Amino acid sequence: SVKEFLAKAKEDFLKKWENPAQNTAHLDQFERIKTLGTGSFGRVMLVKHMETGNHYAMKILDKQKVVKLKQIEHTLNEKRILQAVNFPFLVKLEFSFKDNSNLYMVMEYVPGGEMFSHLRRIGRFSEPHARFYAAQIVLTFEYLHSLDLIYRDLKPENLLIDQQGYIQVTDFGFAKRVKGRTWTLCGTPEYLAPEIILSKGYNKAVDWWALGVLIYEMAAGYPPFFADQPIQIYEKIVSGKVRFPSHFSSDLKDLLRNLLQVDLTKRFGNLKNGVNDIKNHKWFATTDWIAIYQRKVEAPFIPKFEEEEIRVSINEKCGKEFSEF
């Protein structure tokens, strides 16, 4: 039935992936409540859809700035992916549209902060706390991999902790729909699998390696392969040799040896049973997968967390570059 859940999820996905929804709202439909922050391409605003009452986080991206920063492909890709997927631990794109000046990504409003800064403050997560988060990433990758997506940007900064203490994976700029193998070097050095570094071509198992890195970092407070220079980071990754903190349970060490496995024919998540090798591992014995998916487990930690015009030019900017948006 997991099989049948995933098959239906793939049908929903392919439909939207092949014929992406465009201009599913317009700016005059939203009441502007508060600017939450200013990102690279423009502001993020709390808004309310005036026709329903639902509140959202609307990201505004100035098209000319996206072009200037050479982020057209990443922005288009992220949007195309986000409008086509649906899973409890993936940021939800509710509406998108564009006008003469801007692109708009109307996201579910999910206050809370990223995992990097939370981890820095807390120091390290206990093993139950780390397992709770890891379980959500496991289910999300099970979902994304079933759709032939490789996420390939897993790092703590890409994991929001929401108002319920659950994980939301954000930033699908690098994600690629890949049937088979691919070659592009992207992502943050610490989290890269050996086969990426050595330009061997790679598959979805790079996400399972990155999960290994994430779990270690969550539980240790620092990633397994670190150095001041990226070449020394690469050297460590390629060696395979991982040293564990002394407080790591025996079960955690074993899981991590199986995820941080250089040999692809032994790496958990890359074998005949796929994700189930990970889900059945002793470290996850106490994990109630269904309760996690249904958001019924109480989270170990609940985070605490002058208005200016949106000027729309009378001239369309960068129309052809963003045709697909």
Establish whether 108 is an annotated binding residue. yes
All residues at 6 or more sequence positions from 22 whose CB lies less than 8 Å from its CB, including other chains: 96, 97, 325
Burial 301-316 (b: 16+ CB within 10 A, else e): eebeeeeeebeeeeee
Within 8 A by CB and 6+ apart from 149, the residues are 81, 85, 175, 176, 177, 178, 204
Active site residue 162: no
Exposed e or buried b per residue across 51-72, where buried means at least 16 C-beta atoms within 10 angstroms of its C-beta: eeeeebbbbbbbbeebeeeebb
DSSP string, 134-197: HHHHHHHHHHHHHTTEE----SGGGEEE-TTS-EEE---SS-EE-SS-B----S-GGG--HHHH
Q: How was this structure determined?
A: X-ray
Exactly one of 62, 99, 148, 153 is catalytic; which is it?
153
In the chain, what are the domains? Answer: 2-19+114-304 (1.10.510.10), 20-113+305-323 (3.30.200.20)
Is 111 flagged in the annotation as binding? yes
The number of beta carbons lying within 10 Å of the beta carbon of residue 140 is: 24
Residue ranges of alpha helices (H) inside the chain are: 2-18, 63-68, 72-82, 115-122, 127-146, 194-197, 205-220, 230-239, 250-259, 276-279, 289-293
The answer to whether 109 is annotated as binding is: yes
- 212 labelled as ligand-binding? no
Are residues 194 and 240 in contact, defined by beta-carbon separation less than 8 angstroms? yes
- Header resolution in angstroms: 2.0
Helix, strand or coil, per DSSP, at residue 214: helix
d(CA 302, CA 314): 44
C-alpha dist (Å) from residue 57 to 71, 75, 110, 201? 21, 17, 8, 37
